[model samples]
Target: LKAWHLPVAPFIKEQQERLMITLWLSGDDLPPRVTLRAEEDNEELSLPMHRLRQAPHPGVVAWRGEINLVNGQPRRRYSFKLLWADRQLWFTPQEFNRFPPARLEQFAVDLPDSGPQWVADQVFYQIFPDRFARSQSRDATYYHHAAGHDIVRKAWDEPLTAEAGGSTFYGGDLDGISEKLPYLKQLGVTALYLNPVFVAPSVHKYDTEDYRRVDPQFGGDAALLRLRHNTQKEGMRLILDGVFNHSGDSHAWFDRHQRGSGGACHNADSPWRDWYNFSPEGVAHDWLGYASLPKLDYRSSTLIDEIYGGEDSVVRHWLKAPWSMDGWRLDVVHMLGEGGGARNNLRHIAGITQAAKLERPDAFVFGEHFGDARQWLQADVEDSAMNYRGFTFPLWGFLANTDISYDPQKIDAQTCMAWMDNYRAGLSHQQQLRMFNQLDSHDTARFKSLLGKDVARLPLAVVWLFSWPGVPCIYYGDEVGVDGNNDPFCRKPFPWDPALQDGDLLDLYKRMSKLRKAHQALRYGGCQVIYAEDNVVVFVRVYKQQRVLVAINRGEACEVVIEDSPLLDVNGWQLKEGAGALHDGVLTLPAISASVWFSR
Candidate 1:
């Protein structure tokens, strides 16, 4: 290809706040009167350029744009081209057929003004509070019953059943989590995303009963503050789960909204009645038909005033108080639309986002926004999402060679790779890095289980989790090789015994997380998919001082060759912590393993 000559600099600026593209052409290559074009929002800009500078390489004249900040949109476009006596010359990213203003990260609108985007550079840990650990200090004993079911407290070694309900409590709490900070710190955890910890009637705490208090069962408000202190001292951030979609039937508000006796929703005539959607005849709607969990009515000015419209609103309190939480991970965020749902969810979401962000100005607030969250993210309603749509789903589809979604059909490796690319295309580079990417959560089967215990296939997924953009949100115990399928199972207690842990997997996770922390390219570097097929997916991450070439061979062993490589820093290419060697840029990839090369 003789070096394909023009240099449309791939966002060569610090964290991509500013970009300046340069084009170089020899006398025969120069296009007379070349121009630059930027089009967006029903407006287009064209600037003719003749500005020149001596080329670093002799005989090559350069035309460059003034350092500029360029924001982007899916429809936004830009081009590097001009006319040579009516003959046109065009330039576009080699991977993209048409010109895209820039990748999303390169387009962060407030790149220079946004708060400490530390989340983008650090790994995160997702802890389902009650299942993570149980402290010796735990002494509360309580009976739990919900929806005609009895939930008994299980011992630390109790077996998990798939159908277990919300009443089952493993006694794990915030104190337990606090005590384990060192373990997490060593695992490269920079943040903790805990499941709902507020006072609630269910084990999951999604059905909140009170916003004013942390459930004493989980060590109350004191435990929360202490955990916060512990996390801060350890140099980690702690974000709690927030369930604004509904309240449990036992909530004080619900109690006031309902009459003393009824066969259906209560017909209360009190001040709290407006907090929920109710028929004139007095029947209220439940969340997805869960009678015990009533969907909230955001249209209620009173509810808004209490939950987020004010400084003391549930959303803002923690960011300011003794609790001082880093931020929140909104649960069932999509269902929080107006009037109990499928309505103006975005309006309410944006409301919470504004309230929280304005309060802290730097607090990170994301959601359980499932599926193609493009619209929500585009609106800038929330910082990012759990990324089930973009990361987990596509990754599992590749590793398992089937849909990780509900469907039973299998998906090809190419499709999985494409799915990853497509979801990312919908977001900005900035949002992609801030995403809470995980292969499992309290809501689904562990990634290992998804692969039917074909444990060897794991490194590929984990490597990408760290190498790809976004914070690697490792579900508790995922690094230690815990495996389960859905609900109560996914919420298994954190195993403290060293013998029971998967040392090798732990080592892998430690290695990956360490590498992530060590390199800027893997954390927020620009991503380019080099190849994706034949049970293989290869990509490159390029940053100023760091470059990485990742190859995932999930099918069979193969001799892979990169016809042309971008690695120009290192002379000898070696796996960061493995045995792969690069000979003329061709590396042997073993079946079901991942190879991460420190690009030279």
Candidate 2:
């Protein structure tokens, strides 16, 4: 790290409803003259960067400034220039190369307040609908399908081995979820995220037969509407998974092939021919070479119209009428419709976002991307992503002692904290607070199970999940000690029997969830890493007059003395929650534990 290398990033407003920019510079440097660029038509104004002596980050000095209006946009693109060392070496977010001599690209404002009102405060409970629950409303015939993929009916408590193809069902449905809302409320969450409920062939439901049709096997459209109504009555919201990337081979569009005079994929004059692109060999564009999942051709104006464009569009349809949904968890949004050599994917994504929000302003939309999605996340395309790079990788990296993307190599906790900090720093404060923070989602293995089923490693991570910035998403059955490897194994049925669950872990989730609900600072406060070293990392969240401190001990028990933190004053502080004892500016933390304290 060079002393002259000043790093600046955009964040949410801390003290007011404006744009906050955080600048990291050498401690030896002057109160560097900083100016905002491109925020106005033909002007730049100097901003302040107050020195923070006690920040967790060392070597470099930290400062913060807030700008009220930037180009008259709450979500505008702009840059800045730091007058340091009398040299104007320029910088920009690596994603943007449009800077002059390359100024630093950043958001001049935080996220718009009008998007999804409930995002920041949600403890997301993601349910793989088919594996979560089963109700009397769903009969045996529903699980026995005539068309689409073959399925093996499994008992509620069986694990799927590799030999067990991913196409099995356990009769879990929306009605089942609706039935569990009372218990779900006890589980401490305001939102439920269901994996694809739309008509699909596979159990995962990423491949859609019809975007508008909810599968009858999962209680069809009625079940979804029923669930929505129940959740609304229970003051809970429903987030449905939308898969616009491809269609199942058995879907009408694909099924049109060779019916009478050549079907859709095989026929040039077929109605659904424009919906998909088929080569002369009759093989259409597919998802990762999976012939059963044909990629949707967005080049077709009709396809765009049917999906997200008009009043009758599938995107708008769900946000209205029978299924009045709250949000969409877009499936494979990074790879959504990049097929057929489509380059304007961002425009399509932004269009989908606009369409969904326009239909229902309260609807929250986030994507599912395996890597860094800053490009898609910037300029307000979609709200944010599942935050794999920014949230999961570094978190899992640090806690699991694995590489950043869960690779084989192990990294130190300090290095892991730095890794997580980078991802967190990439977003505007608004984006970071609402990022889909998951330990391991439906796509990966059960995080606890992979850690050698060691119960010790989970407490710290669980504390981090509920206490830190961003929404906490717990995969179904994870909060109660469900363990699996990956894919089919990770997608296990909810062990409904309370006697089978790890009671302590369930209690931990409930306690954490209650704390998150009780404290607004934990949900809306600005996060600053107070200390990080060895296997210990301490962070503080401050909102207006309220300040709370959270410390994690991943190693042995240690007395973490609060020494240099300018933002944290433990002098008259009181314990807001947790098992930690903090008095007169010192905290005693246990091994593999997390603690929380707040000012009285």
Candidate 3:
């Protein structure tokens, strides 16, 4: 219990507080006078250290003076006596952690007003092209055969006349999407994210044979450009999926590999030999060992260049086209590669994106990493990811599993707030503020299926998502009550025949989208969690001076009251006395629902 030495002494282990004691030579010790100077301001402060009357505590052996600050100016330090007895000790001069509380404004630094920014404030609407809508220009040629297989030889301008699987191909083309721009605009969507529209052989174009051509069946490049033009005109941005991990078995690279051309095993001069992994028998490396979709050796500079290097490359080709997109959604970014190579791959992709942004400053690139994406989303790499790790899983898990229940009353609010904070901590504040948030995509079960078709949680989830931090995304069919389980089924055609659509859910989504668009705080703001307990959660989003508080209840019928909160009647938030409080800084929330209050 004796005084520890210098440097390390400041890290003293105290029950209540730790102390760092430094000894400096003063001009005098008997009537000691000391002068201390701060580094940055060149400001000088002086104090006198007095000797102890008795043995100081086992720990503290010296005394220091205190300095005060008022408003924005520093005050003088006052001297005090030091005393200690046995294990106990005390000081005549009171020490505070720091005086005149350090306000957030004082530490604030100027941030980039904009850059190749992340779209954290947008509400994304993911469209699976073929299934969304079709025009008369694509009505006569049936792409899907009786077996639901696509007939690849059909021309791009072929009509879309076909019927199968209790759903007919209405031929939803890019022009159709363009025509419906008003519909989407009215829904308050900020970004339009599309699935692969590249030239491929199947209905769901995962097996891309050509990287440069837009599938003729989907209106080809012209249609995409037009769609892009119309969408931008409507004040919406576009994000196309970059499915570069693998290519269709029919791809030219695979074709070349199959032919054993250019220094390949069959030909010593094959230039594409190192482009892909292949067996002596000529079978290329398959994804998860599937031979139909072969994985490419992304490590090849030649391949990266062919995909993202030139003006005609996939990355630049579409971006520089007449219908330019704002960014790209990198498919399966985590599977790109691992180790130092993985990091390099990400940096390379970021470089390509940066180059593209030289032409379009607001251009962004977000990758899909279903799990821990923090490593790839560094500033030197990607700006942000799809945010599945932070928000997607938690939201779906809560709705899908009944055994893993949360207090219904607060689940939405708490979950939303926690998601914001966790993501913020893991990424730079700018990246966190711009994350792309979604509920269900083509990879998962449809939203209705996730909610067991209950429809009750849909509104609550929608409101929370729109009001929460990060950009909100609506899976194409979710707003229309598209019900299916997992892929293929979830990839079914969009119900264009209003008769089959769920008008109620669509209306609710439209309302929520409009609300989000109208409120600046909901769109771009800092979030704070107020309460999370017993199936209920409450939180607020503040931007500048605007504030919006959201509360959600997931539990069965129950009433709860909250007190001593800034959310009370400060802005005319009136709540019933018994149900909840809205007076003198108290607020009450209802059960099994959500409420959002904003002061205009």
Candidate 4:
């Protein structure tokens, strides 16, 4: 038996205050009575559901119930209770729970549909600006005071090394990225998520020196303006990294160099002294013990206003006028807080989100949470997160038998699916689709390197990225089979030379991108895991009349038996890629391969 729930539409509608909750029960046996048990004023109320005659599948039954929204209830938790003669079962969107699940385990319905409507349809491409491309070569060298090392200017072909450090700059500017718009558009990329481009001394630019100014190394403010105009011309969206959690020591507010003694670092009587968490002895607190990256003290209302609350705050500045950024990708969101470590974190996050949304109603505001981000993704707080916990870690654990830290992970297809299911059940369906999914990112080892440099299993991960229900984001060089371990190594420059790139991997990415853009089911469909065992997993995506099935195998060749008769009713499923044959719901997949099938 299987069960799930979705907010009823108009699917394209936004800011829906009141909603009709639709529940689905699929099995041969039908429940005599179904009621939605919802929380109201800290009490449970049984709202009777009406049986609908029409159902999506042959053995499936549908039920509908009404939910009235109020200001006090921004998010409401509910579960379905199905009763028979002497037995009752609860469907917390997970199905087959004999005992009533905990309140936190139930599904949530977020009022007002706060996320941007454009997110669901976008295919994001993440760029580490310093490594992506450079319009000109740098002949001048600079020094990085924080690293206590000279900022080495490396060639595009120079391999990364630990000694090179994060201060290694390849001179990739925004104008260089602007020059590649045609290439990105050809890959079916609809949006660009660039790492911090603000004025900072570091090559990574995470340590923000000035929120209002673009980094001089990156062609300054005019570069960003031109890139924004170019992206808009290509009908694409641009999101810049917002490093508001902390600022570089180079920033005038926390000047560690004491250029003019106006900073909060050593000057006890400085005007900006209250902007940081300083002890009575004049020592300032930093982020995770990094003195160069000073954490901001939100306890000061002026600091809050300057960062996000005020009309022309950092959060709203770029989203206005000539800059006109589409949204913000908040850096280290989990660590953002008031006085110090995560104090009043949610409040600060809400302030940033509200400010961004107010500036542009359709702005997409998401955060980078390396771990669980559920607390911050509750609709009113953020549109979505980087989806590390929900997508990246689980998939990595399954394929590589290891976690992000390179530790052993004893995970299989079933465990991976269960972990993903738990994440999906917690939020509304719309939130799930708005999630930012990636196989690898700048913070972790590349997926290809994790698989021991074997490109065979790489396609499976790429297929899953596009076929899965979320906004798929391709890390800069992953398309051309760039392999690296972590940190500075993972941030390799994109290979522009044809001889240095992997043709097969690039073709696979282009094909998958085209597939995702051609089929709406892969983007907006309801996902169902029909089969999972050992190193094999098969799932289906259904959106109205469109159906797309994806099968992945990491072991030897296997035949998957999906005994669900409704899935094999001769709906004319045709192979879309790889080699797979579906005969009476039995799928035969090749060894270490991914296959796709779609029905009209």
Candidate 5:
């Protein structure tokens, strides 16, 4: 049994401030009455739905209803109630449930101008600053007094050690990034998401020392301004990493070194003592047991003002002046809250988002979430999330037969499609399109390496990344075939030498990015899964009159019949990429490959 309610045409309509919704059902039997259930003013209201005369398919039935949209209600949610004499069923955004879903789980519709309009049109490239490039060649090992460790600077071609952690730095500067704009532009990347560039002792810069100051190792504020200028000239966007959850132990507020008289660690009388969670014994509570990183306590009013609440807050600072950053990638956003746990976390995130938007109306604020991010993906809380749980993890299980830890966890394409649907359903249309989708990052193993160096299968994942309903993010060296296990290893230097790079993979990236840029249908279209089986899944993206179909086969070369697919009823279809052909409703797919077809 299946029930469908999309945010696009036929399924939804916008008439002034009211929303006309239509729910379609396909099953063995029809319900007595279909009711529209919603929450208004802390009360539940059931509105009657009218049955339509015509259904799209033979076994399908349709019902229509309307909801009055309030001005202040940015995200309004509702669900369908199908009544029967024997029992009743609730149809939410997720699926047909025996029990009613939570209020947030209901299908959502939003007011106009609620989300970032520019995010869906651009392709994103992620850069781990310390491993990407270097402007000035450095060979000496330097010691950082604040971190109390030796900063071992390595060569461009040197191997990374897992033991080095964040102590080692490869000297990749902002000027180096600025100099490589043409390379990224050639790869069709319209946006760059840097890991972290704020002032900090470690190479990763996650434990922030100063929110306003750009790291001198990255050439300071001047270098970033220059990079921003260059990116503007190239018509590309820049997104900086914001680590507001914690501060470095050596930070002025924490003062682990005790260089200053007033520090939060030992002195109870310090001005910033309440900025961090502290036990009665006066020892500052660190983030996730990392003694060098102290978690920020949101309970403190002063800390709140400094971080995001104030007019000249750190979140708004970069959006102004010479450093006009396009957006912020909030680090470990889910873990940040009051005291030690995530209490009132949504309030803080919304505040930060509002602050960023107040500075630049188009500022895209997304967060890092490794698991289900439905709560944070609403129009009010966050624009979207990293989308590891929604897009990457499911595809990894289906194609690679392994989890993020490289452990065996195989799943069929059908299960993968259902998993993707469950996560995608709860989000608004804007959130799904703006979601930050990636194959791998600084946290997990590289995409190619995760497949045990199975280079041919990499294109299958890339196809899904580009065609899926979200913004595709290429983790720095993945396009050129960089392979590694995890952090320090996944964070490897980009191979500038043409001989070391994978020519086929690089071409694929360029083609896929170009395809995404050329088609408005692919960027902002509604997606429907036409077919899904053991190792093959087919989906089509439709926008207005254009349609783009994506087919993938993770097993041996075979032919799959998608009975009654709309593509078979048309004659204007043309092969866009890869080796594939559709004739008489049957699709011939190559072994472990992905193909694309578009309506001309």
Candidate 6:
């Protein structure tokens, strides 16, 4: 009998127990003879095979058996049989055995809990870098206009500067952000999601010129490092933008491609030849065929190593630096999929990102996908995506388009709540809690513009954005009542004059922010809809020992009665009746107003 030994097998106190073990029979077998038995000293416990199933592909079979553990030695030995075609079979105990319940429980208690912890309780903020702030130390420069536009020369390195058009520089630098740490801290922002900060030619910096360096116009590496360190010092986290899809025409890699000798293009001797795809016409294809931005050949392992290989590589270098960042926000993640002739690059990306997390367990890695990111958000790939499918798109669709499909009376509340619910359901409990939810981003129209200059509706929208399921992200100027049309306009300079600011609304934000931070239910809670109607929407946020009821009215002044109902108990809640009515169950709400009721 050929014997195989089981290593680290779990043993437990047995009073009618079941043991399941799978055995593999190899070689050209005759009658496959396999048996599983447990032994402690001279006494052996024979287990009966109850169920068998064939594993998918690769010619493998699995078997399950039951065994009981009684008072004996603290350990038990398990062995299986391998039948051969020539009638020669062997009983071999595997190198590793399954753990018994008692021991397994103890092992579980001792094992380091590396489960999903970050997603459920994080408060994230999204920052559009160019519009955030400007520093005084960096020099300013401008790209020469092709035609009649006036060129404004301002200090490019400064955090906030004057803008000629929407694309013009508004000097908001990393230092400015670092300077406002106290303000963000007061606002209860724990995580920051910064837009592309890589050295790029455009004002938005989506066309990356240098992946390794921060744009000199944004105070370069020094400003980034400073911001990273300061954020950490303030007990906050920073996630940098990861723009790997394409490189700017002005990028060094592209420059090398233009030189023709040894470049990442099609040159045989090129160190990065496999990094990009080249056509017979001697030009590489850009993302969506945009000539200014050339797509990188993500299939190249060499490029992967250069970007995230050693401690000195780009990913590790920034993460391990003195002011190391907390995580990465991957740009254009849908393009990384293997479908539609696109090679599967996520596995390599996952490996690199996981390695970074080894140094900082709290590090976050998010993706940018306009639609469902379920595949990428799985455990095998990324932790989570931007959640655009659930958050941004629905909000955008509701406000921008005049489909008139939705009932206007209930349109605002129902649309927002439905999208929030949809997003919450699409993700696991962990993903839902950790998602970054936003309304006005730099890429989209400003919130005020989206509302069509209806300032009264703003407060109601803000309430929902903050009180909804996921972490709320405030685009830089949204809180200051800044309004713009789109694109370059949405990316305008911040107004510094506090006197010109909407003081009441700002105070409202501060109050709501403080309330969110103070209440566990509001910060990391599970949501349930309590009431829904054409003009009124109400929901409850439940967490550990706290609960909050949120109600919004989107139409003209209306009175709705929410009878003390079973849904309230289902959500672990109690209604605080108003002073006037003890039995009427009438709740009065003004036009475009929100009320949050809670019991501490």
Q: Which candidate wins on lDDT?
A: 5
lDDT of 6 by residue, 86-140 (tens): 4433342112223321111111010122434654455566777666665555335
lDDT string for model 2 (1-600, tens) is 122111222233434546665554544554356554545433455555565566434555655556665345554344545566655533344321223532213433344456575788888899998888998656343331323534667777676767535567777988898888888899898998888888776677776767878888899888888898899998887888888877777677766333345447666787878788776776677778877777888888888988899897988998987778887898878776644544578888888999998889888999997887877876478987887787777767677755334567466667777777656545665677788888887888888866773458787788888977788998889888998877867888888898889888888898889878878788877676767888788887777556778888877788877764445533467665557787666778877778877667
Instruction: Supply every candidate's count of residue pairs whose N, Cα or C atoms clash at under 3 angstroms.
Output: 10, 8, 39, 0, 0, 31
List model 5 lDDT by residue over 446-558, tens digit each: 87987874557889999899999999999999999999988778888889899999988999999999899988767987777778889899988877567789999988999
Model 5 lDDT at residue 323: 83
Which structure among the candidates has the greatest TM-score? 4
Where does candidate 1 stray beyond 4 Å?
Answer: 1-10, 14-19, 22-35, 39-42, 48-63, 66-94, 98-110, 113-116, 139-145, 256-265, 279-282, 566-572
Error of 4 at 396 (Å): 0.8
Root-mean-square deviation of candidate 5:
2.8
2 against 5, candidate with superior lDDT: 5
- Ten residues in sequence with the least summed lDDT for candidate 5: 563-572
Give the TM-score comparing model 4 with the true structure, all chains together. 0.94
TM-score of each: 0.88, 0.86, 0.72, 0.94, 0.92, 0.72
Candidate 3, position 215, lDDT: 83
Against the reference, the lDDT scores of all candidates come to 0.72, 0.72, 0.58, 0.83, 0.84, 0.60
Question: Which clashing pairs does model 2 show?
Answer: 12-429, 91-103, 91-104, 92-104, 256-263, 256-264, 257-263, 258-263
**Once superposed on the true structure, which residue ranges of model 3 sit more than 4 Å away at CA?**
1-110, 113-121, 139-171, 256-268, 279-283, 338-343, 402-420, 566-569, 574-588
Candidate 1 or 5, higher lDDT?
5
What candidate 2 gets wrong by more than 4 Å, as runs, is 1-38, 41-71, 76-108, 137-149, 256-262, 279-282, 338-342, 403-406
- State the lDDT of candidate 4 residue by residue for 332-395, as single tens digits: 8888887767898899999999999899999999999888888777535788999999999998
lDDT at position 80, candidate 4: 85
* Model 5: per-residue Cα lDDT at residue 303: 90
Q: Give the TM-score of candidate 1.
A: 0.88
Candidate 5 lDDT at 88 equals 88
Model 1, span 1-600: residue lDDT tens: 111221113433333544454554555555657566654453556655555655534555556553344654333334556566746655544332333344331222233436348888778888888888877677344544454555567788978875555777788888999888888888888899988888876788877778888998899988888898898888888888888888877786776334244312454565667678876666677788887788888888878878889879989987886877888899888888556565888888989988998778889998896677878887788988989888888877767654546565466667877778667755656677788899888888888887885668887788888888788899999988899877667788878899999998899999998888887787767677777776778777866546787878887778877655333335555478554455775767777778788855
